[PDB]
Design a protein around this ligand. Sequence first.
Ligand SMILES: CCCc1ccc(Cc2sc(N)nc2C(=O)O)cc1
Ligand SMILES: [Zn+2]
Ligand SMILES: [Zn+2]
Length: 266
Amino acid sequence: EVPLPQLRAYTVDASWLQPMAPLQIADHTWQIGTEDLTALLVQTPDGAVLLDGGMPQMASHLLDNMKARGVTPRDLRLILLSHAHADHAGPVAELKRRTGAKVAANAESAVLLARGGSDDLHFGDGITYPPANADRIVMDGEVITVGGIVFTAHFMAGHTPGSTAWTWTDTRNGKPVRIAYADSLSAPGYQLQGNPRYPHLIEDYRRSFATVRALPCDVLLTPHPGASNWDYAAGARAGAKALTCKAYADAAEQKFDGQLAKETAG
Ligand SMILES: CCCc1ccc(Cc2sc(N)nc2C(=O)O)cc1
Ligand SMILES: [Zn+2]
Ligand SMILES: [Zn+2]
């Protein structure tokens, strides 16, 4: 009586995940994701690194744009992420099976990733996806370099205990551009206060706003493009009205404070 993959039935909005070929951001860094979800490929002589991937569908559309930008599965060396939620780490496992890639990630994003997003601090097992093992554990401020480009982890706990920001500089207009890929600072439906699964939640977000402000931030990009008023649907005017870390940050803190305000009502 009806298989296991026969149902199970996934609601899919045909408007999500509308693919898009590489949208260049700098000499070496491109946005190969989809239009509603960041996924930055940065190419290098030694290999290439991917920051975030999006949803689990996206693996083969990402792997496409990695060829449209001259990256073979073997040339994909390293995968970084922002946080280990299904819509940013979704395809990591598959890509690891299909590429030469390995994953670097902090201890708390590694655990969430390895249990596939299950037992989420706020969504339980609703948001469950294909688990992956991390190949390298990173410490706050640790630097990873690949063929000249230098990546720095900045922990910004909040959205996820393991929410990270990565920073690297590459050329572009010939001058350096200090690229801050900052994680979500959102808190959707989250019990903020007296949360037994995250007692320093308010404190952590608080320190993460400050962290994001201080980022070496010529160009901010966020995993949800619109979080920083990008619009990957405006050609070379994507980051035209792109926010700055200070702006992004003060924005989130302001909405956070408002969230908090309504929780402390009754
Ligand atoms: C009126 C605003 C509705 C809204 C807007 C943004 C979010 C945040 C979401 S969603 C999603 N799939 N990821 C995020 C994230 O924070 O990374 C949640 C809800
Ligand atoms: Zn998330
Ligand atoms: Zn998200």
